[PDB]
Design an enzyme around this catalytic site. Structure first.
Site, PDB file in Angstrom:
ATOM      1  N   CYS A  37       1.232  -1.190   0.027  1.00 46.62           N
ATOM      2  CA  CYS A  37      -0.097  -0.177   0.327  1.00 46.62           C
ATOM      3  C   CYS A  37       0.623   1.430  -0.151  1.00 46.62           C
ATOM      4  CB  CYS A  37      -1.325   0.443   1.464  1.00 46.62           C
ATOM      5  SG  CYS A  37      -1.518  -1.596   2.300  1.00 46.62           S
ATOM      6  N   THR A  38       0.263   2.946  -0.351  1.00 49.42           N
ATOM      7  CA  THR A  38       1.216   3.303  -0.490  1.00 49.42           C
ATOM      8  C   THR A  38       0.322   4.474  -0.430  1.00 49.42           C
ATOM      9  OG1 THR A  38       2.194   3.040  -2.149  1.00 49.42           O
ATOM     10  CG2 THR A  38       2.977   5.213  -1.999  1.00 49.42           C
ATOM     11  N   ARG A  44       8.507   0.464  -3.759  1.00 50.28           N
ATOM     12  CA  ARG A  44       7.468   1.343  -4.686  1.00 50.28           C
ATOM     13  C   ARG A  44       7.929   3.158  -4.064  1.00 50.28           C
ATOM     14  NH1 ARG A  44       3.199  -0.022  -2.337  1.00 50.28           N
ATOM     15  NH2 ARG A  44       5.259  -2.067  -0.672  1.00 50.28           N
TER      16      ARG A  44
END
Ligand code: TON
Ligand code: TON
Ligand code: NAG
Ligand code: NAG
Ligand code: CL
Ligand code: CL
Ligand code: CL
Ligand code: CL
Ligand code: CL
Ligand code: CL
Ligand code: CL
Ligand code: CL
Ligand code: CL
Ligand code: CL
Ligand code: CL
Ligand code: CL
Lengths: 231, 95
Positions: A1-2, A175
């Protein structure tokens, strides 16, 4: 997740997030935006899956916006003792409790930081006034670190994936760099919900496991936007 | 368009407030979906251990947390153990 909280040149604060999780083909059909009403008036907005009562992405209108990312530390038996013997709180539930009971960005950041938890987490909070943006790294018993926005020092955005920010993201799953890279180039002048969505639409920030992307601004609640992702 | 948008009035008792939403969803898709998230990652004895102790376990969790799950599992005809297993799924594997 980001999760990404960032500020633009005009003083506005924006919050966006991605949610990656297996079993995507199912959760995409069950993903929904929910408006929780008190006395008929909206009290907050959230994105959840049918059957899940907690919130991992929410917005208290004209107060703050919060999202959560997974933090895997400790031992398996810590969660057991904390949940049953110490009666700590689930992550997704605390996030929802705060969205409903916190009276200000400051108050929310207090609850999300000091309330005991069953396991660790990253809480990302955004506000309605400039410089209101933090990334709360949570230990089970309290905050392990608070990471504040500092536009005048050149930090106009905070990017959190699933790793502590004072250490480099692993090579396998980095990421953070492509998210920073796309933000470094977007420029604090061009930042907006439309642009911040395209930041999270970058690979591998936008990967096979992404289920939905949310962009939101506490001071612009009507702009709450979630988009299911079919890669 | 984006995903569907629903309303959930916190002025309704915890067990009832989520139900008007579930009308829009096939009781089978949701239930069959759970079994895929459950059956493939948790053995039954754990599920049995939970089921047997689920009613004492929910005594510990926040009242409104479980009450909302209980109501959904009765409407959907899910086992309460299956309900608590998906809502505490993060807390089950985050360490
Ligand atoms: C009808 C079901 C099976 C869907 C749900 C159950 C039995 C759990 C239920 C049924 C009724 C109920 O009463 C709530 C109304 O109370 C107002 C003030 O307290 C609460 C729960
Ligand atoms: C009852 C649960 C499982 C729903 C939730 C709680 C938080 C109590 C939990 C969560 C996690 C947990 O870890 C057990 C892992 O088992 C490894 C066997 O060698 C144990 C309990
Ligand atoms: C949610 O409540 C508001 C309150 O006025 C209402 O206008 C709106 O139609 C409701 N949402 C849906 C999807 O019906
Ligand atoms: C509902 O649950 C009961 C009890 O487990 C079971 O006997 C019945 O067959 C179920 N019905 C449906 C339609 O799932
Ligand atoms: Cl609540
Ligand atoms: Cl408060
Ligand atoms: Cl400023
Ligand atoms: Cl701890
Ligand atoms: Cl502890
Ligand atoms: Cl990170
Ligand atoms: Cl769009
Ligand atoms: Cl897409
Ligand atoms: Cl209706
Ligand atoms: Cl639908
Ligand atoms: Cl209809
Ligand atoms: Cl047993």
């Amino acid at each position: 997740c980001t999760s990404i909280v960032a500020q633009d040149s005009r003083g506005h604060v924006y919050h966006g997030r991605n949610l990656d999780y297996p079993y995507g083909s199912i959760l995409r059909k069950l993903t929904v935006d929910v408006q929780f009403l008190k006395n008929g008036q909206i009290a907050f907005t959230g994105t959840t899956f049918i059957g899940y009562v907690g919130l991992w992405t929410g917005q208290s209108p004209h107060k703050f916006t919060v999202s959560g990312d997974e933090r895997d530390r400790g031992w398996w038996w810590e969660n057991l003792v904390a949940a049953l013997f110490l009666r700590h709180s689930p992550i997704s539930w605390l996030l929802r409790t705060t969205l409903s009971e916190a009276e200000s960005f400051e108050a929310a950041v207090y609850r999300l930081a000091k309330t005991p938890l069953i396991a660790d987490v990253y809480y990302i909070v955004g506000g309605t006034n400039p410089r209101e943006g933090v990334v709360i790294t949570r230990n089970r018993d309290g905050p392990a670190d608070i990471w504040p926005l500092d536009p005048l020092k050149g930090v106009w955005f905070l990017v959190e994936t699933n790793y502590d920010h004072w250490k480099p993201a692993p090579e396998e799953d980095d990421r953070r760099t492509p998210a920073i890279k796309a933000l470094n180039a977007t420029g604090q002048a061009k930042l907006s919900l439309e642009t911040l969505f395209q930041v999270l639409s970058v690979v591998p920030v936008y990967n096979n496991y992404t289920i939905y992307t949310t962009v939101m601004s506490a001071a612009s609640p009507d702009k709450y936007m979630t988009r299911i992702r079919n890669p | 368009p984006g995903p569907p948008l629903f309303n959930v009035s916190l002025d309704v008792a915890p067990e009832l407030r989520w139900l008007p939403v579930l009308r829009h969803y096939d009781v089978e898709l949701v239930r069959a979906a759970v079994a895929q998230v459950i059956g493939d990652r948790v053995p039954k004895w754990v599920l049995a251990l939970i089921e047997k102790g689920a009613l004492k376990l929910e005594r510990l969790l926040p009242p409104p947390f479980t009450a909302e799950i209980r109501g959904m599992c009765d409407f959907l005809n899910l086992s309460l153990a299956d309900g608590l297993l998906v809502n505490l799924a993060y807390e089950y594997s985050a360490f």
